[PDB]
Amino acid sequence: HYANQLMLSEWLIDVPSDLGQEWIVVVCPVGKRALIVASRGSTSAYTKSGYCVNRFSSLLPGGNRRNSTAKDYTILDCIYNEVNQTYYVLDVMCWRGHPFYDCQTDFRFYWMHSKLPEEEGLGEKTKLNPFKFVGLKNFPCTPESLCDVLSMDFPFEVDGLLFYHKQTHYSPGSTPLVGWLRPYMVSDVLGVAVPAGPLTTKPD
């Protein structure tokens, strides 16, 4: 079935000792989690719960009129952002038929840092690509980096931060090797200094 296909995070309560040297953080936009599947001709979006929420065309190698082939299917882990009609790419499980489930995440993240941009107008709205696909940036988890990101400006309403272990592979379901925290939470839970501002402002 198409359900339980996305790797899920857990609240990050315990702080990994090798955090700054073995983990990377991703700032996530507000939106809906989605399994994306481009296969022979078209692209389909599934919910975390497994059912299709859309079937359209995209500039992904998988489905599309112009660009298609056998086992040329591509599978992504995305967060759909309504206000921007954009599918923010979080992870890649399979590209052009090359599976990446058994690969460590820092490889997966780097592999999309360069292969997504290589697709002509993937980042723009177009007749064959009505929905934009934009890869999310990941950063180091050193104190300085965390401060950098927490003071950065994003083209979307930030929902939270995901913490990935560089070594873990891709396995569907919740896992401790992937952490989650609202931005205004890092100070307490991660015991570090942080730049005052929108992203670090706690709710009272």
Ligand X SMILES: CN(C)c1nc2c(c(=O)[nH]1)N(C)CN2[C@@H]1O[C@H](COP(=O)(O)OP(=O)(O)OP(=O)(O)OC[C@H]2O[C@@H](n3cnc4c(=O)[nH]c(N)nc43)[C@H](O)[C@@H]2O)[C@@H](O)[C@H]1O
Out of 5, 10, 15, 189, point to the residue binding ligand X (CB under 6 A).
10
Residue given tokens 């339980």 in the structure block: 4
Contact flag: residue 11 with ligand X (CB under 6 A): yes
Contact flag: residue 8 with ligand X (CB under 6 A): yes
Paired strand residues for 33 = 79
Pairing mode, if any, of strands 132-135 and 98-99?
Answer: unpaired
Stretch that binds ligand X, among 3-11, 62-70, 104-112, 144-152 (CB under 6 A): 3-11
What letter does residue 4 receive in the DSSP assignment?
S
Contact flag: residue 174 with ligand X (CB under 6 A): yes
Q: Is the Cβ of residue 31 or residue 183 nearer to ligand X in the bound state?
A: 31
3-state secondary structure of 11: strand
**Cα–Cα distance measured from residue 68 to residue 39, given in angstroms and rounded to the nearest whole number:** 8
Out of 159, 182, 184, 187, point to the residue binding ligand X (CB under 6 A).
159
**Cα–Cα distance measured from residue 81 to residue 105, given in angstroms and rounded to the nearest whole number:** 23
Q: Is the Cβ of residue 34 or residue 59 nearer to ligand X in the bound state?
A: 34
Positions touching ligand X (CB under 6 A) are 8-11, 28, 31-33, 47-48, 159, 162, 174, 180
